[PDB]
Amino acid sequence: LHKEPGGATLIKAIDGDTVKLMYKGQPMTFRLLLVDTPETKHPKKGVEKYGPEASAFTKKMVENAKKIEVEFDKGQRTDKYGRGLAYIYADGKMVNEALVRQGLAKVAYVYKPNNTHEQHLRKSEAQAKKEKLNIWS
Numbered sequence: 001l002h003k004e005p006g007g008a009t010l011i012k013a014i015d016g017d018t019v020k021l022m023y024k025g026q027p028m029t030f031r032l033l034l035v036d037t038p039e040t041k042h043p044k045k046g047v048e049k050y051g052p053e054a055s056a057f058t059k060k061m062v063e064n065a066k067k068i069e070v071e072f073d074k075g076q077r078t079d080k081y082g083r084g085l086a087y088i089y090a091d092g093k094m095v096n097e098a099l100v101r102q103g104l105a106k107v108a109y110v111y112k113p114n115n116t117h118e119q120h121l122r123k124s125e126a127q128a129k130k131e132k133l134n135i136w137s
């Protein structure tokens with residue numbers, strides 16, 4: 001994979017795994033690859049436990065970053081909702097992994113070929129589960 005040249009700027013973090021960014025001068029909604037943070041918006045699931053916590057975590061991490069970078073995987077770059085599918089980095093730390101390492105997201109929606117960081121993220125999930133962190137508490 002390679003990060004896209006430069007970085008994006010934050011417009012609005014919507015919840016733990018979805019953020020709107022100004023990416024190449026276009027406002028874009030991005031959904032984080034290979035993770036799921038708990039739901040806070042859609043009424044069918046309601047506000048899931050650790051949903052508020054995952055949102056605050058993502059928001060702080062992207063708001064305090066000097067540099068936000070976007071890395072696409074090898075397959076499709078947008079999902080069926082028109083959301084960009086990427087690994088997002090806040091000063092070179094992957095948000096997707098940070099969330100999983102905190103037990104604030106589960107590794108989910110693994111669709112080949114978009115699975116380059118799947119084993120890295122599953123190792124972080126394993127560590128959060130053996131530490132009983134948050135979702136795994």
Ligand SMILES: Cc1cn([C@H]2C[C@H](OP(=O)(O)O)[C@@H](COP(=O)(O)O)O2)c(=O)[nH]c1=O
Nearest residue numbers: 018031032033034035036079080085109111
């Ligand atoms: C992360 C990811 C989600 N999605 C879809 C799967 C789910 O579709 P359905 O809504 O039809 O269940 C939804 C999960 O996103 P949310 O967690 O934002 O709801 O987004 C993809 O299509 N590809 C991806 O790589």
Ligand SMILES: [Ca+2]
Nearest residue numbers: 017036037038
């Ligand atoms: Ca989610």
